[PDB]
Design a protein around this nucleic acid. Structure first.
Length: 167
RNA sequence: UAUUUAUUUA
């Protein structure tokens, strides 16, 4: 992209001043906004930062993505143009073979579009995959196509079909 | 089985 970034997985405890201070350390900011619930005013876990110089947005991604704050590992990337088309593109998947890795899950789902995020849930105790997870596509239409082409199907070597639905 | 609960901001 260019100068506008979206920062995800922000700690519930982080303040906008800390937000601006952390990203302000990279370079001049034209504006930034820790997103908050319109009624409660509490942080929603993410925010945006728009740099003056695109080279700084690049440096922000290169240096701050993966930074661990409190219980979070923040993610820094380019904000896609705000559009209703990117909303509601998150899927809930179950029945996956527990042998499946996240790399394989994305390879499976990527046939239908650009993946923004993927996550396979694991058991705290045994540590074994639970065969469930989430996949968020770039476009709602891509998620709809994945539901149609993957719900009730059996992946590559699977013996059991999987369920795909909007989160 | 709902995520590092929560990726598009008067």
């Amino acid at each position: 992209s260019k100068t506008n970034l979206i920062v995800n997985y922000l700690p519930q405890n982080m303040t906008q001043e800390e937000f601006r201070s952390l990203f302000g350390s990279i370079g001049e900011i034209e504006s930034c906004k820790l997103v908050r619930d319109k009624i409660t005013g509490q942080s929603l876990g993410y925010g945006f930062v728009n740099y003056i110089d695109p080279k700084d947005a690049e440096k922000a991604i290169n240096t701050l993505n993966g930074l661990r704050l409190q219980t979070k590992t923040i993610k820094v990337s380019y904000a896609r143009p705000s559009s209703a088309s990117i909303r509601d593109a998150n899927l809930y998947v179950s029945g996956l073979p527990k042998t499946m890795t996240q790399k394989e899950l994305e390879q499976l789902f990527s046939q239908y579009g650009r993946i923004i995020t993927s996550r396979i849930l694991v058991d705290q105790v045994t540590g074994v995959s639970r065969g469930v997870g989430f996949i968020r596509f770039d476009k709602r239409i891509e998620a709809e196509e994945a539901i149609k082409g993957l719900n009730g199907q059996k992946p590559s070597g699977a013996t059991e079909p999987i369920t795909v639905k909007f989160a």
